[PDB]
Amino acid sequence: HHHMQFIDLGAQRARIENRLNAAISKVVAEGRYILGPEVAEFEKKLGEYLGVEHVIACANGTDALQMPLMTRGIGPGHAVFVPSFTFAATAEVVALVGAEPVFVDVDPDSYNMNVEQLEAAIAATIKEGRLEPKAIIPVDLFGLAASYNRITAIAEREGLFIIEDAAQSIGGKRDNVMCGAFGHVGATSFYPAKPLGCYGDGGAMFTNDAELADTLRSVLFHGKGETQYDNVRIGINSRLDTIQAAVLLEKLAILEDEMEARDRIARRYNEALKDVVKVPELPAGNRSAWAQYSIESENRDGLKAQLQAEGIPSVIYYVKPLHLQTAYKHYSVAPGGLPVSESLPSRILSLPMHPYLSEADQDKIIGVIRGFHGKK
């Protein structure tokens, strides 16, 4: 018997099984469970991969977005511009620090923050005069880099801080700049299903600013000052475990080949499916991390059921955009509302997508989708 996985961690582990065992056993034996050598080693190796001078490992990708807001003093009285079509963390951290998220729609093709509407949202916030614009958190949704040149042009006028939410986009790139290396600071997650993932919770932050890096390293260890005995700011506890850094070192050594595989797999879906469903085209000069391979379909509920009847898993990202969820629905939304974010949940679907998807399994998936849409 054979079967397919949505994101196949087992196939990946099989590839590097004994290397993972050794890396884990070394940490277990050495007894340096907190900030042991593998942590700094991973920060360095990931830094060179991404071309960023500073990598600050931490506990998870939510923490990774919160800490930069804390270092900038963002909090009560302050507005942070975020997509609604994203994972809750992007907006939640803004509320957690006492600031308000302001929700911006996404582009109907890239699923990433709409730049024109961002500009309008900032202008409306200034006109209302109740909050001060402080930051923008674009998301590289599904692995595809957001439009950082136009977003930064807006930030330049307004003095705003940009945090790249690269939770889903490690391995992605746009005109030879790696995802992670945009904005003032980048953030990611090593949640196990991400393109670069560990075997527990983990995260990191990225920046070329040495001062910002020093502040982040303070914040993640209770706001430690220049000495071991005096905390100079409010912080948190947000460390990447040595044991998870050891896992990540082995994941990182195969990430680039896996990115080639993902690109190959995505292109094969796009060429085979473009006439029956809406496919995620890769714009010139981009590589996506393909955290998800997301299509839009007529009768999407019908399609998903037929895929499951044929033993094919699929997932809807996202069922409820943030601005419609109870916790965030009272926060302000950009002028014009969020029609794209509101309508995508009725038609979007993510398909199995990982480096180990076989030709045969992909063919089967293609066949079911084409068949559903009346192709013989």
Ligand X SMILES: Cc1ncc(COP(=O)(O)O)c(C=O)c1O
Nearest CA among 66, 324, 21 for reference residue 199: 21
Per the residue annotation, which of 194, 251, 375, 376 is the catalytic one?
A: 194
Its sign, for the CA torsion 102, 108, 64, 174, is: negative
How many residues touch Mg ion under the rule CB under 5 A: the total is 2
What minimum distance in Å lies between the beta carbon of 248 and ligand X? 13
Which residue's CB comes closest to ligand X? 61
Is 375 annotated to bind a ligand? Reply is no
Is 168 annotated to bind a ligand? Reply is yes
Q: Of 6-14, 56-64, 112-120, 259-267, which segment contacts Mg ion by CB under 5 A?
A: 56-64
Is 5 annotated to bind a ligand? Reply is no
Give dist(CA 8, CA 343) in Å, integer.
Answer: 30
Interacting residues with ligand X between 280 and 339 (CB under 6 A)? none
What minimum distance in Å lies between the beta carbon of 247 and Mg ion? 12
Rg over CA atoms, the chain? 21
Nearest CA among 120, 111, 156 for reference residue 138: 111
Give dist(CA 142, CA 124) in Å, integer.
Answer: 29
Q: Which helix (H) or strand (E) holds 256?
A: helix 242-273
Q: Which helix (H) or strand (E) holds 6?
A: none
Residue 156, Cβ density class (10 Å: 0-12 exposed, 13-18 middle, ≥19 buried): exposed
Q: Of 7-15, 60-68, 121-129, 305-313, which segment contacts ligand X by CB under 6 A?
A: 60-68
Residue 117 binding ligand X, by CB under 6 A: no
Residue 237 binding ligand X, by CB under 6 A: yes
User: Token pair for residue 153?
Assistant: 């042009």
Give dist(CA 65, CA 83) in Å, integer.
Answer: 14
Catalytic (active site) residue 375? no
Is 237 annotated to bind a ligand? Reply is yes
Residue 201 binding Mg ion, by CB under 5 A: yes
**Residue number, 59 or 82, with CB nearest to a second copy:** 59
Of 12, 62, 238, 294, the one binding ligand X by CB under 6 A: 62
Residue 107 binding Mg ion, by CB under 5 A: no
Residue 174 has a CB neighbour count (10 Å cut-off) of 22
Nearest CA among 17, 7, 8 for reference residue 247: 17
Give dist(CA 97, CA 67) in Å, integer.
Answer: 9
The item of Mg ion, ligand X, a second copy, none sharing an interface with residue 26, based on CB under 5 to 8 Å by kind, is none
Residue 63 binding Mg ion, by CB under 5 A: no
The item of ligand X, a second copy, Mg ion, none sharing an interface with residue 38, based on CB under 5 to 8 Å by kind, is none
Q: Which residues bind a second copy (CB under 8 A)?
A: 9-10, 13, 20-21, 24, 27-28, 31, 33-34, 59-63, 76, 88-89, 92, 95-96, 98, 191-192, 198-201, 222-223, 225, 228-237, 239, 241-244, 318-320, 325-328
- Residue 371, amino acid: G
Instruction: Match 């037929």 to its residue by tokens.
Output: 306
The item of a second copy, Mg ion, ligand X, none sharing an interface with residue 27, based on CB under 5 to 8 Å by kind, is a second copy
Residue 4 binding ligand X, by CB under 6 A: no
Instruction: Match 């900032």 to its residue by tokens.
Output: 122
Residue 149, Cβ density class (10 Å: 0-12 exposed, 13-18 middle, ≥19 buried): exposed
| Angle subtended by helix axes 37-50 and 242-273, to nearest 10 | 30
Give dist(CA 342, CA 94) in Å, integer.
Answer: 21
What minimum distance in Å lies between the beta carbon of 333 and ligand X? 19
Is 278 annotated to bind a ligand? Reply is no
Q: Write out the binding residues for pyridoxal 5'-phosphate.
A: 61-62, 168, 189, 194, 237
Residues binding Mg ion (CB under 5 A) = 59, 201
Catalytic residue list: 194
Residues binding ligand X (CB under 6 A) = 60-62, 86-87, 89-90, 139, 165, 167-168, 189, 191, 201, 203, 237
Q: Write out the binding residues.
A: 61-62, 168, 189, 194, 237
